Amino acid sequence: RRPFQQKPLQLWSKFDVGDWLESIHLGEHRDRFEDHEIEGAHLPALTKEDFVELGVTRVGHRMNIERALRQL
């Protein structure tokens, strides 16, 4: 169990995003989204060029990240 499972998207600290990323099998991105201090409130406003800057250069990852967003 982890605190992102327990609080709304908009209250996710940068550490919570990192927890959620790993939960969707994208922990490879956890440290670069943490240095950019991406928060939960940030996740639904990320543009494709944001995702590149965050190093999510693979289409497949972008789309997994965004299937998961809607599941929330």
UniProtKB/Swiss-Prot annotation:
Every SAM domain range: 12-72
TM region positions: none
Compartments (UniProt record): Cytoplasm; Synapse; Postsynaptic density; Cell projection, Dendritic spine
Expression tissues: In brain, highly expressed in striatum, thalamus, hippocampus and granule cells of the cerebellum.
Disruption phenotype: Animals deficient for isoforms 1-7 exhibit self-injourious repetitive grooming and deficits in social interaction. They show defects at striatal synapses and cortico-striatal circuits with an increase in striatal volume, dendritic length, and surface area and a decrease of spine density, length and thickness of PSD. They seem to have an altered molecular composition of postsynaptic machinery in the striatum. In contrast, animals deficient for isoforms 1 and 2 exhibit a normal initiation of social interaction with a perturbed recognition of social novelty.
Biological role: Major scaffold postsynaptic density protein which interacts with multiple proteins and complexes to orchestrate the dendritic spine and synapse formation, maturation and maintenance. Interconnects receptors of the postsynaptic membrane including NMDA-type and metabotropic glutamate receptors via complexes with GKAP/PSD-95 and HOMER, respectively, and the actin-based cytoskeleton. Plays a role in the structural and functional organization of the dendritic spine and synaptic junction through the interaction with Arp2/3 and WAVE1 complex as well as the promotion of the F-actin clusters.
Record-stated family: Belongs to the SHANK family.
Entry domain remark: In isoform 1, the N-terminal region preceding the ANK repeats interacts with the 6 ANK repeats in an intramolecular manner, thereby restricting access to ligands, such as SHARPIN and SPTAN1.
Subunit structure comment from the entry: May homomultimerize via its SAM domain. Interacts with BAIAP2, DBNL and SLC17A7/VGLUT1. Interacts with DLGAP1/GKAP, GRM1/MGLUR1, GRM5/MGLUR5 and LZTS3 C-termini via its PDZ domain. Interacts with ABI1, HOMER1, HOMER2, HOMER3 and CTTN/cortactin SH3 domain. Is part of a complex with DLG4/PSD-95 and DLGAP1/GKAP. Interacts (via PDZ domain) with the GRIA1 subunit of the AMPA receptor (via PDZ-binding motif). Interacts with WASF1 and CYFIP2; the interactions mediate the association of SHANK3 with the WAVE1 complex.
Listed name of the protein: SH3 and multiple ankyrin repeat domains protein 3
Entire-sequence positions represented here: 1656 to 1727 of 1730
